[PDB]
Amino acid sequence: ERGQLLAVAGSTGAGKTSLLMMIMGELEPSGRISFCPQFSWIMPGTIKENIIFGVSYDEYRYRSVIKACQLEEDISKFPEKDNTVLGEGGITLSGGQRARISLARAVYKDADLYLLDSPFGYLDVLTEKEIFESCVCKLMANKTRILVTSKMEHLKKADKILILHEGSSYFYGTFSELQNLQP
Amino acid sequence: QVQLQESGGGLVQAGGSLRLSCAASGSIFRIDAMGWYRQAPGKQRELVAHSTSGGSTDYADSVKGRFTISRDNAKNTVYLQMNSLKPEDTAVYYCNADVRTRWYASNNYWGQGTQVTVSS
Amino acid sequence: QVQLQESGGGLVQAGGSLRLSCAASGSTFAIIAMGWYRQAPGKQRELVAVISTGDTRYADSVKGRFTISRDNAKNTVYLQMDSLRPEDTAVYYCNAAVQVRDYRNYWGQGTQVTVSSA
Incomplete structure (x- = not known):
């Protein structure tokens, strides 16, 4: 299962009662875990810090994460670039840009397991298609990824898929193995 | 099996409102x-507005304050109330939706697209 | 809206500890992250630690000494400050990231942490 993408569909909860929030909840403080929430946040400071804070700096990893998360064009436009200060005292970002800063912060952290709880929810069909493909598919291709989704296109591209029911019931397999089940 | 049908387009003299439906x-x-995505000739398909199931609305900087995205779940339709239309807005408006044909996950559908033209 | 009040500041000797509360x-139900900052006189507010469901992060200068924790029942975010050095002398602030249909951040009032030599 190491280095694979598990797409979780079905009854996976919503908001602060999502299945992943619970789990991460029950785990509240044995390998490293990087969690990406459904709702994006920033803390006052630079764009760079909002992505790399707390993790050791790698020039190659930082720049690749920005490229894959579609932040290269956004950042370039700002006069200060990635040294642009965020918040009430600085620049105010759009939901889409902040969603991308949130994903980059999770993707940049070196961890043994990545738990992405619907991080494309507030992104457009075009932005999501590109980020899913260049970030979770290509960039994170050698990482153990657990992506909560609800998009049939994300189940088609995952190594293994998991469909949850409200009850104890569930399907664990591939998208093709699911298609052959009661076609 | 899903089909996305639009209406509420047509010609409006600049500064006037127009309400799209899908x-x-x-x-x-x-x-x-x-969501609503537009495409003027000589340009690629781009975002206008993005609505989620949980009533979250996002707008492209270009249409902010003028356009409004809304939806009726019961009538299974998305609306775009566009106000104070300027000539740059003129393009073809595409309705886009993630529709569950199976309870657990959705499929992406684009609309045929209606022409919104701007007079004077 | 969200109101943040910091407590727990004080005068300690080097090697000592302090537990700051925010x-x-x-x-408070709309808070999705909480940062801990420090401001020295005539200088900017530097992020020290940040907490949210799923992660805790620390500045390279505080790692292995400061612990960011929380109590959801009390709506309080703590900063356990161990093996304190004079350079930790600052005014500590908490910033909360809030999403309630629209997004913004909020600052606290500050708590003076003073660390002397030994």
Whole structure:
């Protein structure tokens, strides 16, 4: 299962009662875990810090994460670039840009397991298609990824898929193995 | 099985309002994300507005304050109330939706697209 | 809206400890992250630690000494400050990231942490 993408569909909860929030909840403080929430946040400071804070700096990893998360064009436009200060005292970002800063912060952290709880929810069909493909598919291709989704296109591209029911019931397999089940 | 049909387009003299609509027809279960994307000739398909199931609305800087995205779950339709239309807005408006034909996950559907033209 | 009041500041000797509290009021259910900052005189507010469901992060200068924790029942975010050095002398602030249909951040009032030599 190491280095694979598990797409979780079905009854996976919503908001602060999502299945992943619970789990991460029950785990509240044995390998490293990087969690990406459904709702994006920033803390006052630079764009760079909002992505790399707390993790050791790698020039190659930082720049690749920005490229894959579609932040290269956004950042370039700002006069200060990635040294642009965020918040009430600085620049105010759009939901889409902040969603991308949130994903980059999770993707940049070196961890043994990545738990992405619907991080494309507030992104457009075009932005999501590109980020899913260049970030979770290509960039994170050698990482153990657990992506909560609800998009049939994300189940088609995952190594293994998991469909949850409200009850104890569930399907664990591939998208093709699911298609052959009661076609 | 899903088909996305639009209406509410046409010609409006600059500064006037126009309300677009887009209903979903098929074996639907529920609708998750609905949005309006436009494409003027000599340009690529781009975002106008993005609505989620949980009533979250996002707008492209270009249409902010003028356009409003709304939806009726019961009528299974997404609306775009566009106000104070300027000539740059003129383009073809595409309704886009994530529609669940199967309870657990959705499929992406684009509309045929209606022409919104601007007079004077 | 969200109101943040910091408590727990004080005068300690080098090697000592302090447990800082950041008490949230108002729409505390909409807070999705909490940062801890420090400001020295005539200088900017530097992020020290940040907490949210799924992660805790620390500045390279505080790692292995400071612990960011929380109590959801009390709506308080703590900063356990161990093996304190004079350079930790600052005014500590908490910033909360809030999403309630629209997004913004909120600052606290500050708590003076003073660390002397030994």
